[PDB]
Amino acid sequence: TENLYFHHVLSHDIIPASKPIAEKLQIQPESPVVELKRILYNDDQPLTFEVTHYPLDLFPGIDTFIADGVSMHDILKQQYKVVPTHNTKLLNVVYAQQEESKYLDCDIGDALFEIDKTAFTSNDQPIYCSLFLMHTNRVTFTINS
Amino acid sequence: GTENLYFQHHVLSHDIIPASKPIAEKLQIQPESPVVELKRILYNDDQPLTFEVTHYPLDLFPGIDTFIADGVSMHDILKQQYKVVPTHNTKLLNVVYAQQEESKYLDCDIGDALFEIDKTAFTSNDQPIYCSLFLMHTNRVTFTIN
DSSP: OOEEEOOEEEEEEEEEOOHHHHHHHTOOTTOEEEEEEEEEESSSSEEEEEEEEEETTTSTTGGGGOOTTOOHHHHHHHHHOOOOOEEEEEEEEEEOOHHHHHHHTOOTTOEEEEEEEEEEEGGGEEEEEEEEEEETTTOEEEEOO | OOEEEEOOOEEEEEEEEEOOHHHHHHHTOOTTOEEEEEEEEEESSSSEEEEEEEEEETTTSTTGGGGOOTTOOHHHHHHHHHOOOOOEEEEEEEEEEOOHHHHHHHTOOTTOEEEEEEEEEEEGGGEEEEEEEEEEETTTEEEEEO
16 A cells, blocks of 8 residues: 555666667667666665666666656756657566565565566657566555546 | 466356445445446466456446356456556555465465455546456466666
């Protein structure tokens, strides 16, 4: 019972794209991507642990803009003239590993909602992908059809 | 994923019962109003995929229990018998934990994590018409929102 509809920067490293990342972003195997990890709190309780990847070949230098309090949507718009037009989201449950348990302050093995989101711009071009993890005791999702 | 429920059939039972507090609150009817409690299972193959419990207020849909049978589209009954079509719905998604009844119908263990989708359907004038709780084992489904 706290409703998500349907910011601390931990790290950002430039890494080669894994198979599933390269597949979602429609880019070459091992392409350079920025791996941005952020924790969203509400309140001093960790609410969402976010890992987003930006293809450096589309947004060259995008890592350099990253910092606490920075709106990446504003960076995309102001710096690269890109605004997302739609997104595709999948929702599953996955199970916390060492990293998630640290940042979400939970136990290894705890059930987490995983939202796997791919954002797109004009002509169905993927621009970034995000995986948001939330402890299942801490959130309810609202969907208004 | 697994099996894919996009966001945005055997009849187990139907009984006429008094509305609970939460059901009467959702349906905006008097406490203990008569409701039809329709329980159904939807199967993937032989695998139980959704255990549905839906409540229809008998005061809005008098005699609606008499239309209930395997294979019946309740949306069809509402439309032809009552001239009602839903115009929108609210849905909440949570995780809950199987008790004896769910464990039987969903063929899982007591205590297993289930997704619960809590749905209220509405017609013209924002009038609630029925409410549903769908339970699905967490290993067996992925939801898509696009």
